[PDB]
Amino acid sequence: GSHVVQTLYPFSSVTEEELNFEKGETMEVIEKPENDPEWWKCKNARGQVGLVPKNYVVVLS
């Protein structure tokens, strides 16, 4: 149904196409690493969605 993502470590991003928000709960990633680059992006309650480092999270679908 809906592919979703979850976080474990409130780690910060670096790349310019990323987003720096206090991660803690679950988010939904639209960009997958199967067709798109190794980076993914999900929307936060911040109104902005950047590229979140999977190395600092765990997907939850």
Which among 28, 40, 27, 24 is positioned nearest to 3, based on CA atoms?
A: 28
**Taking the domain 1-61, which CATH number applies?**
2.30.30.40
Method: NMR
Task: State the number of CA atoms in the 13 A half-sphere of 38 facing the CB.
Answer: 3
The radius of gyration of the chain's CA atoms, rounded to the nearest angstrom, is 10
CB neighbourhood size of 54 (10 A): 14
C-alpha 22/C-alpha 5 separation (Å) is 15
Could you tell me the end-to-end alpha-carbon distance of the chain, in angstroms, rounded to an integer? 8
C-alpha 36/C-alpha 20 separation (Å) is 21
Any residues with CB less than 8 A from the CB of 12 and at least 6 apart, and which?
20
CA distances from 57 to 10, 23, 45 (A): 9, 9, 17
